[PDB]
Amino acid sequence: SMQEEDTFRELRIFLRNVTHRLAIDKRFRVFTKPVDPDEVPDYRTVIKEPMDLSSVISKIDLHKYLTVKDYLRDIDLICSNALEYNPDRDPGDRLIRHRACALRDTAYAIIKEELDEDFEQLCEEIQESR
Ligand SMILES: O=S(=O)(N1C[C@@H]2C[C@H]3CCNC[C@]2(C1)O3)C(F)(F)F
Numbered sequence: 001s002m003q004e005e006d007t008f009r010e011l012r013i014f015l016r017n018v019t020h021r022l023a024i025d026k027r028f029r030v031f032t033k034p035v036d037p038d039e040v041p042d043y044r045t046v047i048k049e050p051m052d053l054s055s056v057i058s059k060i061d062l063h064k065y066l067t068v069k070d071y072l073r074d075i076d077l078i079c080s081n082a083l084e085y086n087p088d089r090d091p092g093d094r095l096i097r098h099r100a101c102a103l104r105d106t107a108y109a110i111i112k113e114e115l116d117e118d119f120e121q122l123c124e125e126i127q128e129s130r
């Protein structure tokens, strides 16, 4: 229905706003673009499904996300990729891991405060009907 297409348009507006608030935070700069295969040829042999905030914006516009749960699976993948590619005790790895955990925690805290639980349940019931 037109009403259901209006619901998914409101979901995309909400997800673009959360993503741009994460992307402008100086802590999260390393997560804003794909890894450059020139600088880091080993990245794609370690990490089988790369993800970053510029790819998330592209996916919102391609209508890849019908629920906030499917968006949060890609925020989780940004975080888990950084924990697996930078796992050592040295300061450079510990700094990216702290930043990856702060990206994930910040996304979930904005969603807890600003997403209505009944708007998410509506999106889930339209997805399950298709
Ligand atoms: O605008 S940005 O130059 N930057 C560049 C990226 C491309 C767009 C789309 C979403 N992915 C993150 C990002 C962040 O925004 C900065 F100010 F540094 F945040």
Ligand SMILES: O=S(=O)(N1C[C@@H]2C[C@H]3CCNC[C@]2(C1)O3)C(F)(F)F
Residues within 6 Å of the ligand: 067, 068, 069, 072, 108, 111, 112, 115, 120
């Ligand atoms: O961590 S959650 O358990 N979680 C699970 C919820 C259901 C989906 C839908 C979108 N947003 C909400 C949520 C996030 O994802 C909560 F703390 F309750 F938000």
Ligand SMILES: O=S(=O)(N1C[C@@H]2C[C@H]3CCNC[C@]2(C1)O3)C(F)(F)F
Residues within 6 Å of the ligand: 042, 046, 084, 085, 086, 087, 088, 092, 093
């Ligand atoms: O061993 S790794 O290939 N690797 C990839 C990185 C390259 C160097 C330098 C930075 N610190 C972390 C790391 C660990 O070391 C992995 F499997 F990804 F852990």
